[PDB]
Amino acid sequence: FLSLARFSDTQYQRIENYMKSSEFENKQALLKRAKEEVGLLREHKIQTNRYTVKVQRELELDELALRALKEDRKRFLCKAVENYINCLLSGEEHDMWVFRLCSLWLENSGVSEVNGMMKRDGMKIPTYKFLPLMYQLAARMGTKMMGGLGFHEVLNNLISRISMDHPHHTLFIILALANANRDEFLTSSQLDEDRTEAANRIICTIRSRRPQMVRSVEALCDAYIILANLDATQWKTQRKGINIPADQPITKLKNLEDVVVPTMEIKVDHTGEYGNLVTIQSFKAEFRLAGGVNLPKIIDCVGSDGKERRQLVKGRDDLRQDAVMQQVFQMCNTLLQRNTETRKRKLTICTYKVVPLSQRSGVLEWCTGTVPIGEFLVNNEDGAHKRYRPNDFSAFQCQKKMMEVQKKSFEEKYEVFMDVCQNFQPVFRYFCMEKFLDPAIWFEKRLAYTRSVATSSIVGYILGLGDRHVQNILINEQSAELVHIDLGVAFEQGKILPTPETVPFRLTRDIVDGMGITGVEGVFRRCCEKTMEVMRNSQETLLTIVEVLLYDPLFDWTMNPFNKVAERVLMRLQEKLKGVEEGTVLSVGGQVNLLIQQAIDPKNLSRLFPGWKAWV
Amino acid sequence: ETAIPSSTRQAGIIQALQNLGLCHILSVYLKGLDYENKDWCPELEELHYQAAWRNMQWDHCGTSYHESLYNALQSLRDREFSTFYESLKYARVKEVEEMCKRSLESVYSLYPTLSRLQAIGELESIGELFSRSVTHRQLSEVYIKWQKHSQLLKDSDFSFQEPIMALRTVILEILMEKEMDNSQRECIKDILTKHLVELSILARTFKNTQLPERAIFQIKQYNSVSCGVSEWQLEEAQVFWAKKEQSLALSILKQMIKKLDASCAANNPSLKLTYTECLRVCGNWLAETCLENPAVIMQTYLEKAVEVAGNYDGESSDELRNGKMKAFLSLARFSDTQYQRIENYMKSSEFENKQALLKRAKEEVGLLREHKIQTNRYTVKVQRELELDELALRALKEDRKRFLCKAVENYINCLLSGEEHDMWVFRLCSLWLENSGVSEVNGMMKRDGMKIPTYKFLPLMYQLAARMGTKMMGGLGFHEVLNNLISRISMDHPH
Amino acid sequence: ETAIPSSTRQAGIIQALQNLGLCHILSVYLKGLDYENKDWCPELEELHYQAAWRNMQWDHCGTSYHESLYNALQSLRDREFSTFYESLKYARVKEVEEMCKRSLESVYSLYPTLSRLQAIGELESIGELFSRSVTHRQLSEVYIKWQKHSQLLKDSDFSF
Amino acid sequence: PPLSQET
Ligand SMILES: Nc1ncnc2c1ncn2[C@@H]1O[C@H](COP(=O)(O)OP(=O)(O)NP(=O)(O)O)[C@@H](O)[C@H]1O
Ligand SMILES: [Mg+2]
């Protein structure tokens, strides 16, 4: 079944690509010219000579070929969808093809035959196989894909059944979608209104069967929303901690039995009943400020087991982008685990749960057991650079030089950057030396650090992650694996900034030195090549994960009155994945070498923002 | 497989080992055959003597051709020309009578006999040279005779050419072994190195990588590295490239470039031509593997090789003009490939979608400028991404034009004084005609390409004769230059 | 290349021939080595016994692991279990003491020893099965045990 | 001084 389905899918994709090529457009234009010339030759009484018969016959052959091609493409689409259904009805080892099945079904929703077959044979498919793509299904209730009411009703029924079977992984998504204007209500096109109404129908349908659970989850969500909307601008000068005012419902919200903590991932089973999950017990009475213009709020929640779990309620910010980033991070980790080449290398991506709650607010999981890179390296009091190289220039001196040179030209900037790097030697190589005295543990941690750096850099380059200064990277004190936490700007946004980001990822001298004597060559280069090969071998899955856009555009876009920049970013991501750029084919080795050269180039590092700490 | 009879199974195994470059392994395996099997059949005895003389196993002790050849080689090493000549005469008689006793009727059967007789004749020439003394002029005339005859064997099979090269290598090794320390030893060593490199290319063109590696090993055994790298390092890089070791070949060639450009000092025209060859090879390898963008590799290697060859062409030698022609052709082909790639990308549907998105951005920016609207983060982002898209499009168009100009100019340079590269006139004419709207290419064609010989356009004369229509409006300059070129061609070849 | 010392050059050649599927060629090459070189170093003697038992060259005549394995195989072929069990016990003791005498500290070094011990244990199971008689049920349960353990060895290296 | 390049 899988082999037949894969062959049918490949043939359908080949036909679709041929139909979307410029050659097909040229053939269609020639056919239209032939049609209009035949029409003129028929309206006007003209004798049938050799040329007229030849034109008519070649037109008939072209029409027959086009009709046969369309029918064959439809029969391949039907065969591929049917065989995906058959493979997934009673299969477990082939559960990774649900993304291809959903992509084929959603991209061809206009055909009633595939929708009817999906609602007839695929209606009995287990609901636990759509959880990774649950957000993608939840973003398809818009009416822009007018393929009849049958597709909408079958999609709604499937979503309702999935939510009933696994409410933990669905209620937060539906309420977040339905709470787009909740911040404004507590303190918008036709597509948004229709999606909101569909989400409200889903919520009321679920609450018909689980009223207590639904009302408790929405009460917790509203408490988080009001906490995020709370104005803490008067507490910007306090760092020890500020007591939450009693008027907030979060303080009085305690003892939840049917509510599971969102910031902790839940190991989903094949049974629809959950009775061994950590619930919400109480909330702490103090919260801390993490700094910044937006003033994020850090809160601690006590679970059923009594273990405190730190949470970050990032208000006045759009965390939907971070949710997409975490979903693609999990997809990359799963694909790396699936491939036998990377499974042996144990290539993994450190991920933290992000649970959006509204368009302008949300919550995310706090990372524990990690220390900032900048705090470890360039600390004023006990920094690594100060401790190991007192004679070298201090961080304050480097900052002063960078401040004084930003008003100079390219030559002065390059000269001062080269002088700073001359009088500032890397010190990051001593992290594992001073934290792992046992040589075996020291090398194991160093190897894990190098593999994490390579995988994170490759994925960051693919996703266009640009905000990568010292405070956005966290290193674990036990596993020595870098964790990306900020994710605030990505998708090639650094170029929009006044100081363009000339590097794809952070590969500074400290990072290179900490990888060992071999440097970038060796483990880093081989891991980057393996990650690039894995990403290039699953472009359909990566695009499917990223294609959640164009249906529910996030905030900061489509303002000031098929999204423009969402299609631009999809085009750029596809170009990066295919390695085509402006028509030039690049192998995985060549792309890795080019990325390394760009990242380590002092010319590119000189023009970067002084606060990015390129020398560090 | 053990079902094959041992009469031909052992012969096939030995032949496979010989063609796989394994010599010591074959010698030990044959010693094990001698240990386990006492009597020797004629076939395996002949293979024993063939491996004995090929591997220079002088310890091992009618007669077959290989036995006679080994006996003659031993007699030459023992300065016994009486038995050397008697053995060669007996081998010639045996080969002639064996060849003529059969029914013949097949030309392909004559090739092994002709190759064996050629090897015997070459050994006779070596014996005549080594009869009393060796001089530089005699060694030079022997080598040039060998090279000329090997040129006559370009179309011959590698199976019929390998014994000749192996015998030549053995002869040169014997000469090196029995040469007194003088200036003649250096000449013989240089001749041996040249023979080994020609054997390296000869085996490389026949999809063989073991014998070329053995030749490079012998080169490293005799010759030694110094500040100035010789021409055999480039052949070693080519061998490693043929062995699918692209990283090692590139590293070796880059090290050669780093040594040459740092310690060239115009010491030798041979070093100049091998520097140009190394730069051309590196540029071609970078272009094919695509580890770097064409922008830097083109400037670093192609134009560098072109200017190096063109700055010291005061001798006008054949060994310099052919290298300059090859450098011109490689640069022209790379420029043509890049131009075709850019044109195909511009004609793709993705480019059309990008253009449509750019047009939408342009019209939305125009609306945002006509209507007084404050500049928020969205307006700034849209304006900046539009500026970047416009800059990228302008850079792509300029780069495409510079590749078109480079390709046409290098085609002109290659065809001005070239004969072996006359098949690229079709590509030159296709590029010129398809881009007749550009006045720069037309002016360069009428300035530098006006002196191109008129006999190279005859196959495409009809194509030129069909281009006087005005549908390709590219100015009157293109029509006048096309008419003048056609008139000159017709005057030169009216028929 | 001939600059490599013959101590490890011959071992590398033999290993390459073993991994290239050449058995009779390796046997003849090793016979030529025996002819040209009289004395045998421990490494090449161990490779000789490894190729002897792997190629079933029963004609060829402390002891290394491969020598003990070949002796046990010959004893099993001769219906002699006393020396077969003594040889396997000696091989197990030698492998354990050799493994534990070094500094260890590396997991990858344990894999060759675990593989050799597993081979010894499998030979012990075969000897127990072939002690008095063979039955279809015993052969089936031996094969299914082997298949189940090979399933447990899916992630292991092909060298091991 | 802030580390990130705010807006
Ligand atoms: N998951 C996390 N675990 C630990 N610390 C975190 C996490 N997310 C953010 N932080 C830290 O909390 C602070 C603010 O978080 P961040 O997401 O950077 O907010 P922001 O206001 O958008 N700042 P920025 O974009 O960097 O200017 C910083 O010091 C971060 O390093
Ligand atoms: Mg941040």
Numbering used by the authors:
A (entry chain A): 2387 to 2573, 2591 to 2964, 3002 to 3056
B (entry chain B): 2052 to 2112, 2121 to 2554
C (entry chain A): 2052 to 2112, 2121 to 2219
D (entry chain E): 12 to 18
Q: What do the authors of the reporting publication say about this deposited model?
A:
Ataxia-telangiectasia mutated (ATM) is a master kinase regulating DNA damage response that is activated by DNA double-strand breaks. ATM is directly activated by oxidative stress in vitro and in cells. Overall, ATM emerges as a key cellular sensor of oxidative stress, initiating a signaling cascade to respond to and alleviate deleterious oxidative damage.
(A) ATM H2O2-activated state cryo-EM map for a locally refined dimeric C-terminal region that includes the FATKIN (light and deep pink), which was resolved to 3.0 Å, superimposed on the map for the whole dimer (translucent). The major movement involves helices fα21 and fα22 (residues 2377 to 2476), referred to as the FLAP-BE [FLAP-binding element, where FLAP stands for FATC, LBE (kα4b-kα4c, residues 2793 to 2828), activation loop, and PRD]. Upon H2O2 activation, the fα21 helix of the FLAP-BE tilts downward and shifts inward, while the fα22 helix kinks inward to form elbows centered on residues S2407 that nearly touch each other. Interactions between the PRD and FLAP-BE′ helices are drastically altered as the PRD path completely changes in the activated state compared to the basal state: Instead of the PRD occupying the substrate binding site, as it does in the basal state, the PRD moves behind the FLAP-BE′ helices in the activated state (right, light green). There was no density for substrate peptide in the basal state particles in the H2O2-treated sample, but in the population of the activated ATM dimers (in the same sample), we observed additional density in the active site for the 12-residue p53 peptide (p5311–22). Seven of the twelve p53 peptide residues (12-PPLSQET-18) were visible. The phospho-acceptor site in the peptide is a serine (Ser15 of the full-length p53 sequence), and the hydroxyl group is positioned by Asp2870 and His2872 from the catalytic loop. In the H2O2-activated state, a platform consisting of the LBE, catalytic loop, activation loop, and FATC is exposed, on which the substrate binds and presents its phospho-acceptor site to the adjacent adenylyl-imidodiphosphate (AMP-PNP).
